[PDB]
Amino acid sequence: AGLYTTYQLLEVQRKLKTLPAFFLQWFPRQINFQEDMIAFDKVIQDVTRV
Amino acid sequence: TSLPNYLAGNGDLGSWEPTQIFAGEADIVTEGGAAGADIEIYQVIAKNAAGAMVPHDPTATEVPAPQSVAIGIAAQPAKSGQNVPYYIGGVFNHAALGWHASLDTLAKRQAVFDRTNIHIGNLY
């Protein structure tokens, strides 16, 4: 005291706000690729006409 | 200043916020020159007709006066007659800098440094 008060530090408090992985549970497949693009082929075959 | 305090009490010791000046990765380049007016830290500066640094003052004049064309960013503050170190190159966060009045929006703050080695832009 007098000149400047001594201080005892308590542990730092951190409001570390993450954003948790929720939607990524439906994106489990991982593809790392160096080709320019990814491509799909989708086929619809109605074998239900009379 | 003599006595301690024996009584209990609280105290808000203070707060600290970083000031980020750089907003990119150009070659940061600096120079020093005499000041003509009281210049604050990271104030945008021009050079007056006598070659002394003066805080940037657009619409100074009817022909525009040389104070009106910005030339750098003060690196440390200075009073008139003292030397000011200032940036002449680099990419700078417009928010941290001291600006003239009416030079409000980033769209205007860029227009001051288009023909120049300095470029001024937003942080994310």
Next chain:
Amino acid sequence: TSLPNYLAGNGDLGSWEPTQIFAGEADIVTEGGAAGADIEIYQVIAKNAAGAMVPHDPTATEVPAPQSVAIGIAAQPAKSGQNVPYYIGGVFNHAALGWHASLDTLAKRQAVFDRTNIHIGNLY
């Protein structure tokens, strides 16, 4: 879109030549901004009175208008209203960029950038 081709013909799959954008070894510096008109890759860019990126157009007025002073090189294409990332600084290959017409010769194409971090150079 699903008929095959039967008549024989010469199979010219395609042709390719690199776009060597850089003609030097100086500082590459970039920032993106709002676009005021459709802008192609490596087009030369100016800024209109509203501060939006507009493709460079010398002689746009009896007083020159701000679209007439080039300010950067588009790094990716963008339609109006979108944000265009563009180069502010570097040495760029004379031939790779999109210059508007009547800015034909390298003598002129350098005259567009005689002060800024952008410099236009030949290749060898």
